[PDB]
Structures are given as structure tokens and as C-alpha cells.
Design a protein around this nucleic acid. Structure first.
Ligand SMILES: Nc1ncnc2c1ncn2[C@@H]1O[C@H](COP(=O)(O)OP(=O)(O)NP(=O)(O)O)[C@@H](O)[C@H]1O
Ligand SMILES: Nc1ncnc2c1ncn2[C@@H]1O[C@H](COP(=O)(O)OP(=O)(O)NP(=O)(O)O)[C@@H](O)[C@H]1O
Lengths: 460, 452
RNA sequence: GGCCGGAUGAUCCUCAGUGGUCUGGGGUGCAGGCUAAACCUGUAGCUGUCUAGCGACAGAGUGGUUCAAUUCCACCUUUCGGGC
RNA sequence: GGCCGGAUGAUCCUCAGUGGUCUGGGGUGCAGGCUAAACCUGUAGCUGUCUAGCGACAGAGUGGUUCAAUUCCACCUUUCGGG
């Protein structure tokens, strides 16, 4: 949520720059114009109600002084000092006044919701470095690489996961209903190894490991999610809403798609002290995405699925200076040092504003090389959400309120990384366990993961 | 689901023994009587429809040979003699007569399955016959040192460690919600790591299960009460297209048991490898509506948690299923003794025993700080009950496999258990086995950075 | 946990009044006439809206009652108490 | 991706035929005969009901036209052919 004083030309800001950022974000403007109109209308009815309340006070004052002495025409907007009037005359006015403040009360109760309806779907301010386009496959500014992204092995991550016999998809489709899977055996330990290391990595950096709830009520979710996320991403969960045998009511909930949302809402409506402001968080959570926007893409593998575990970097920081951006760079550098230490070739990709969602100001996502698949695949996505969500969740820094900047970046998607190491470490007998991962693996697997099953695709 | 030939006195079984088991399970009978009536009715209408189609076949046979408007007679006899116009007029009334029966049968099959759905498994004679667990529970062993106390509840300790923020968890999840943070995460991660490696050392297959299961399958692996006061319903798009505005109801799992059971639904299983082990790792989701105002400050009974479970497919022949059952509870015993926690084995009475289980031995562990025993483990032998429901087969005369399930470890409850049983004045001492998987700085002990 | 209670949120702090737009003892600190201390006056915070600005007006938990509520009442947030 | 065409499911292989509860030519696994192979003859998978048992009847993806649908049109899923 952007600050409201930005729309007022009376204040420092201008709506023209907002329209520009809307066009550059590739979201159709006009919502800005409706915001401006509803705003100015909420200025009118506010001044009306304030003046009607001022006259409301002026009436009883006349009623008070005249009553200390003793014991039918309209003049609505011409509300003078005017002592002279009967108590019976003044009392008759209050009725018409009350109805006049009521119509404005409804007009304001509808205006506030109308303004918030548009403001809800207005994106954050972009950083000048962000590429201005809509096609990522074209205008993505690649900004570094590492390892050995010139080799291939010819063995898809769909195939290897069957040859290892750590995957039964046909049954997972029976249970969960398409894309469902049963991760079994060695692949479990490997994942458990990843989580174990990744956490210890962030723990070595100075992050606070936090296991988050996998669902959040509803009211909170709306504040930390745009419409599209509710439409084609989040799984709704209906609960009893009351732990009593008597109550037959319900309370709508939703499953999280990331640790980002609970960790963000962890410090909702707070006062954060600058004495410790560089606050780090390492969110461990299973993540649930409907992924409705895709159909017939990565259908045989486990790269894009409905359920998975994923460790998250989440950092609260101070808005002052560009120390938020320096922390942003420090975070992506940490992820770089991480996937470097893992020994996987990758390249940094700058996502265009067209694909950038509302909250983020700048989104640098990492794509990793798949030698067996012969492609690059988004394995990370760092984001600087700035004060956008911080103003929405009302998390504070006197006077003239300042909001902190909030960020998020996936340390590791346990199922995609799984595919990544499956292809990049293969041999003729099986997948060699990376030197770092050998630490957490059990004996028998610590050497390498063997193939106890042939290639999934036989023929006639 | 029990076998249907048990109700037929024509077959080997008798419904009198079923009524007895219903009374002993403390579920009101009469559903057995309704089962029997609907059954015999489904025998009548089946015989009706079978004879009516036999006659339906006999009609066209006459029509066929004669071919190589005359109303006739009353309404099976010999055939012969009769016009093709006479016979053709009969088929209409017949068709309506088979239709009324078709509806009567389509309602009878669902009516019978409605009652059979809520009929419990056959109990094992060892099972205590009562309804109050706090009274008639037969304890069968113990270990460790269940005579000591420390005076420090698992509610306070989790705050003193500063690995818990409940007031915010209640804001997000809505009561009982929690944010497990810091050292408590590693400890949990240590548990999972060890527990898996333990079962992996035993010869179990670690399996990460889906946390939701369509709907149709669920109805087969869950009774009514579970749908009423336990499982969280999840509404999904049902189609990954921008065009489809439909929905498909789902539910969240309360145990790994349900996905692992449904993993081999409708299969042919070979005796060559029948002793099949499974070690199901999964987050578990329970509404826990049946409780309110019980363990409200702590994290013993919550809505969400991770939980590793033993799941074993076995052969029905001999009592090798029961021997495997004993082997499994013995494995859990060897596990928690290796953890070094005082406990005692409790035999749950039939009154609290659900439909699926034939015998349910649950482990209660000692809480020195709380001064009580708490349910952490829950071994169950579901036998062929679910295996007949999920149609998991073994020539001739079909035989069903016996299925079992037993929690290896509840990561949040066991967390409380080790929180109380390993406390010192500075903090909780890390168990000798757990020191292996902990990070340096914590490997010694978990300190208190917050007061009570 | 239960009642019966009190306090309570947003005018510098505190005790307390009072249905008349508020009053008063008393207090820390602020500006200064005035004779370190003493005595007098005067001032006091946040939000919203109006003006370029000085400035003014509108808000005091959600509501009810009344022309009018800080007080009379209801109910909520938190806090203490006669207590069990 | 959408078009002019391909198959399906529940009858041991296949070929084709064919509105009468199917037919025929030839080839895998049991059984039997004559005497390694060939040849000769019968059978075949599952479900449900009925007699206590022999055995028989009912079911072949759902649904219309026909008395009768392997056969002729409609629909479902999956997998396959040239583009
Ligand atoms: N199905 C998934 N499984 C695991 N991680 C995922 C999945 N979808 C998205 N992510 C994570 O999201 C991060 C970046 O993608 P993000 O932009 O958040 O969503 P996105 O644009 O949907 N990704 P995708 O849905 O695959 O196109 C990746 O680094 C992943 O780690
Ligand atoms: N709320 C819970 N938290 C952790 N584990 C649970 C919970 N409920 C059941 N379990 C697991 O289920 C097994 C024993 O409980 P169970 O036999 O299912 O009934 P229970 O103890 O009545 N359910 P509950 O009312 O939560 O106590 C153990 O393996 C437990 O760890």
C-alpha cells in the first residue's frame, strides 16, 4: 500500500508519476484517476461532515445558554452565530441535521472502501535499475554467472527420479489429484540434508530459524496478498472456527504459498526499535501453490508442483539511506555464496516490471543450469517489497510516521534444487553426493545414490 | 469394512457375534439388523432382476425363431405359442418392472454401504472391554525412572528458551497457532533426522506423503466423526485452466496413515516380499474440535505438527500380523528407551477404540515438570478392515492383507517430553544421541535467555 | 474459573469533582514579567480537515440516553482489588 | 494448438466378416488322443445372483433408433497414424 499523500498535489507527491509507474508495470491505469476522484470526494464529504459537526456543536451551545435564561425556517449552509432562536426552533433543526450527517456517513463509509479497493491493487514504486518491459524471455538483463554452464549430461530430472526409485507419481495423482507425489527413500534424506545444511548456513550467517504456520485466518491474508494470488494460487481451507460441539459455524482460511506471508505478519502493528533494526529471519515452511496459471508445463517432473518445502530469507531493515538496498545486495550475495558453495552453475536474472507483482520494487531471480534438461530454471527469487507491505501491516519505525522496508528471498526450494543436483551430479551408476552433502547423509548413501531401476521410458 | 459373508448365515459367519462386538465397542447396535434387512432385500431384488432379465432373454429368443396387435393372458412358465405382437407387448411392462427394481437396488446397495461404513473391526480377546480409559486401562510395562519430578511445565520452558511466540500465532492461525523458532527448530530437525535414520537402520522405507487427498479415497479411509471434528476441508480449483470456474473439495491429512494406506489401493500384492515396511514422514493437521480448554497454554495438543509414523503391510496368514505388531511396538519401545525417557504401555479400552483398529496399544510418557503421563505414541492393528475397503489383495477364494500403523514420533509432543526430562538450572541438556545432529553452541545444552 | 465488584482506552502528570463545553488542590518540566530558593500569571499532547501561511474547527474505546456526556447506563480491550 | 482420419473399456492371440445372442482362417499357455516336431479335438479372463452341491442365469463404458446393436449413428477417457 502506497502512501496517500503521494496522490495529493497539495502535498509533496504527484499522481502523474504514479500513472507512469502503472504503465511501466503494465497494469492498466485509470485506477489512479478513480483513486484521485474518490480521494477528493472523501475530502469533500469529510469537510461537509466536519462543518455539519461544527454547526451541531454550535446548536447545543445556543441551546445551553438560552436555557439558563428562561428556566421554523431553513438556513442550512448559512449557519451564523445567531443566538436568537427558540429552543423549540433549534431542536427541530437537529433532526434534519442528523439525517444529513447520516447520508454523508454512508457516503463516507462507501468512499473509504472504494478508495481502498483501488489502492489495494496499486503496485510499489520501481527502482530505476529495473528493466522496463513485459517479455522476460527478451529483455531480461543477465548480470553474472558461475561454475560451468556449458556442459550437458543427457538425463532429464523426470527420468533420474524413477531410476533412483524415489518417486511414485501415478499413485500421487490418485491421492492428491494430478501433480501429487510420494517422495520416498534416498530423495527424502537428500531433502532432509538440504534443509539441515541450508538452515545451518543461515544460522552461521546469523539468521533466526522460524517454523511458520501453514495457514493464516483471512483478514490478514488479504493484507498480504493481491487478487490474482487468491484467484490462481492459494488453497482455501474451511474450518470449524470454534472448538465446541455446539457451534455449527465456519471460518474461511487459506494455505500459505510461502513463509514470506506468516513472517511478514509476525510483526504486524508493532513499534520496531532502531537499536536492533537489521533483523534477520530464516523461515522454514512447507509451501502450497495451486499453480492454476500453468497447464501442460513440467507435467512429468517435480519442478513445478502443488506442495513442497522451502526455506526463506526474510529481513526487516531500516528505510534510511539505501541501506535497505545494500542489505538487499548482501542477501542476494549470501544466496550466491550459498549456491556457489553447493557447486551449481547459475546466472542472475533481472525480471522485467511487466512480470513484477505489486509488492516488489525490484526482483532479481536466479536461474540455474540443467545439463540433463538443457535449460535454465528459476531456482531463486529475491524481492524488495520496501514499505509497501509495512504500511499495510502498519509496522512502524517521531514525528511524521516512517515505515520500514521489508524483503524476501528463497534460500532453497527443496524439490527444484533436488532436480538441480540430480542432473548436475550424475554418473553411470548413479548420482554422486556433493562433498558438502556427504556430511548429513547416512552410510551407504554417503558415497553415491545408485540406480535400482531402468530409464522410465521403455518402448516396444 | 467387514466382509459381507459374515452377515449371511448361509455362509460361515453369524450376525450374533457382530451384535456382541457392537455392544462391546459401545456403539448402539440395530445398524446390524438394518444391515441384515437391507442385505436380504438386496438379495430379493437381485433375484428379481436376475429372473426378469432371464425372461428378457427368453422373450427375444422367441422373437428370433418366430421371425425366421394381440393382447394376451395374465401378466413365467413355458413359452411356445403366443404371437410376436403378444410377446412384444410384454417387454414394456417387464422393462418397467426391472426399472422399479433397478431403483430399489440402487438404493439398497447405498443403504447397506451406509450402515457397513460405520461398523467397527473385530476385537482381539486381549483388548479390555470398557468405556472409561482412566479406569480399566491395563498397563503392561514401564522403563526409566518414572518417580522423579522437576517442577517446570513445558509451557514455561518453551518461553524461557524463547523458541515460541503464541500470542502472534493466535493472531495468524487463529488460536493454538504458533511460531516455532530458533533452537526448538533444530531440535525438531534433529528428532526427524534421527527417527528416520533409526527406521532406516531397521529397514523401513522413508516416504514423504501428500498432505491432502481428493475426497472419494478419504471417505474410504475415514469414519464420519473424523470428517466432523478432525479433518480440515480444502477447496481447490479442480482444473488448472483460466476457463474452468468449478471446484473440487479436498481435505487435509491428520496422519501419514491415510496417504500410505491409499498408496497401494486396488493392487495385487506378492507374498515374496509381503513384509513391507514404511516410514511415513508428514506434517499432520487436526481440527481437534472435541477438545476445548485442554492444554491451551502449551503445544502438546495443537492443530498442526510434523509426525513420523510406522506403517506396515503384512500377510494375514497365521498370527504373524500380531507378531509383526509386537515387533513394531517393541521397535518403538527400543526407540524411546534409546532416547532415555521413562514411559509405560497402556491398553486402550474398546469404548475409545475406533472402527478400523482391532487392538490399540498406546504409549504414555512421564512428564516430570507437569507431573503426569501423556499420550505420545498410538500403535494400531487395522487388519483387513481397510484392506477390504481399499481392495488390496493377496487362488481361489480372495484373501485380504492385514494393515497396521504406529506413530514413530510426534515432533511437537516429544519436544515437550525432552524439554521437561532434560532440564537444568541454566537450561535443557541435550541428550547424548541428539548431540550428534545439533549445531555447535547448542550441542552442549540449550540455555535460558528469558525468564519464566 | 464463577459472581459481586473498581479502574481503563486518545488533552503534561496525579488525587478528586461535576450533565452547562468544564472546575480546583497539588506536581515534574517550558516560556518570562518579579523579588539558588521563594510568590504571581500564562502555556502544555496526538490524529483528521480547511488555508500558501499565521490561525481555526472537528475527534477522546464501540455504542446507548439527552439539546448536550468526562460524569448516567450498556458492552469490549487491558489492569488492580473484597475475596474464594 | 486446433482440424479430415485411430483404437479403448469387461470375455486368452489375431485376421476379417457380419442386426438373430455370433461365425470362420491361422498363431501363444493347460488338458486329451495318435505316435522330438507336425497334425487331430475340446476349453479358456473377471463380476453378481440362484440350488446345500452338480450347474444355470444375469453383467461387457454410459446413453438414443430397433423386438433384437460385435455389428449402425451420439458421448467418455486414454493411448496411437500421416501430416
Ligand atoms: N512449484 C514450486 N515448487 C518449488 N518452488 C517453487 C514453485 N513455484 C515457485 N517456486 C519458488 O518460487 C521462486 C521464484 O518463483 P516465484 O516468482 O515466487 O513464483 P513463480 O513466478 O510462480 N515461479 P513459477 O510458478 O515456477 O513460474 C523459485 O525460486 C522457487 O524456489
Ligand atoms: N494434537 C496432537 N498433537 C500431537 N500428536 C497427536 C495429536 N493428536 C493425536 N496425536 C498423535 O496420535 C497418537 C495418539 O493420539 P490418538 O490415539 O490419535 O488420540 P488422542 O491422544 O485422543 N488425540 P488427542 O485428543 O489430540 O489426544 C500419537 O501418535 C500422537 O502423537
Amino acid at each position: 500500500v502506497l502512501d496517500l499523500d503521494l496522490f495529493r498535489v497539495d502535498k509533496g507527491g504527484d499522481p502523474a508519476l504514479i500513472r507512469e509507474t502503472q504503465e511501466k508495470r503494465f497494469k492498466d491505469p485509470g485506477l489512479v484517476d478513480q483513486l484521485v476522484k474518490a480521494d477528493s470526494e472523501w475530502r469533500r464529504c469529510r469537510f461537509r461532515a466536519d462543518n455539519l459537526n461544527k454547526l451541531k456543536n454550535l446548536c447545543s451551545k445556543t441551546i445551553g445558554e438560552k436555557m439558563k435564561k428562561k428556566e421554523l425556517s431553513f438556513d442550512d449552509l448559512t449557519a451564523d452565530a445567531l443566538a436568537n432562536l427558540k429552543v423549540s426552533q433549534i431542536k427541530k433543526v437537529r433532526l434534519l441535521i442528523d439525517e444529513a450527517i447520516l447520508k454523508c456517513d454512508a457516503e463516507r463509509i462507501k468512499l473509504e472502501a472504494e478508495r481502498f479497493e483501488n489502492l489495494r491493487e496499486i503496485g510499489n514504486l520501481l527502482h530505476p535499475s529495473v528493466p522496463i518491459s513485459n517479455d522476460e524471455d527478451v529483455d531480461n538483463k543477465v548480470t553474472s554467472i558461475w561454475g560451468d554452464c556449458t556442459v550437458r549430461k543427457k538425463y532429464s530430472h523426470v527420468d533420474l527420479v524413477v531410476m533412483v526409485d524415489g518417486f511414485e507419481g501415478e499413485k500421487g495423482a490418485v491421492v492428491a489429484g494430478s501433480r501429487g507425489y510420494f517422495l520416498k527413500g534416498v530423495l527424502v534424506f537428500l531433502e532432509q540434508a538440504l534443509i539441515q545444511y541450508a538452515l545451518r548456513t543461515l544460522g552461521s550467517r546469523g539468521y533466526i530459524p522460524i517454523y511458520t504456520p501453514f495457514f493464516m485466518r483471512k483478514e490478514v491474508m488479504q493484507e498480504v496478498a493481491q487478487l490474482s494470488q487468491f484467484d490462481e494460487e492459494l488453497y482455501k481451507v474451511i474450518g470449524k472456527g470454534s472448538e465446541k460441539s455446539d457451534d455449527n459455524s465456519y471460518d474461511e482460511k487459506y494455505l500459505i504459498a510461502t513463509s514470506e506471508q506468516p513472517i511478514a505478519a509476525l510483526h504486524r502493528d508493532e513499534w520496531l526499535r532502531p537499536e536492533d533494526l537489521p533483523i534477520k529471519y530464516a523461515g522454514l515452511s512447507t509451501c502450497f501453490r495451486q499453480e492454476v496459471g500453468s497447464h501442460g508445463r513440467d507435467t512429468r517432473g517435480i519442478f513445478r508442483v502443488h506442495q513442497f518445502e522451502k526455506i526463506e530469507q526474510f529481513v526487516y531493515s531500516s528505510p534510511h539511506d539505501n541501506k535497505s538496498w545494500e542489505m538487499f545486495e548482501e542477501m542476494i550475495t549470501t544466496a550466491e555464496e550459498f549456491y556457489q558453495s553447493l557447486g551449481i552453475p547459475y546466472h542472475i536474472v533481472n525480471i522485467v516490471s511487466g512480470s513484477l507483482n505489486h509488492a516488489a520494487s525490484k526482483k532479481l531471480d536466479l536461474e540455474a543450469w540443467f545439463p540433463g534438461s538443457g535449460a535454465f530454471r528459476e531456482l531463486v527469487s529475491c524481492s524488495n517489497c520496501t514499505d509497501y507491505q509495512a504500511r499495510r501491516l502498519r509496522i512502524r519505525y517521531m514525528d511524521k510516521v516512517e515505515f520500514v522496508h521489508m524483503l524476501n528471498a528463497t534460500m532453497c526450494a527443496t524439490t527444484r534444487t533436488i532436480c538441480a543436483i540430480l542432473e548436475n551430479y550424475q554418473t553411470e551408476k548413479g548420482i554422486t553426493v556433493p562433498e558438502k552433502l556427504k556430511e548429513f547423509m547416512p552410510p551407504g548413501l554417503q558415497e553415491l545414490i545408485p540406480f535400482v531401476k531402468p530409464a522410465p521410458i521403455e518402448q516396444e
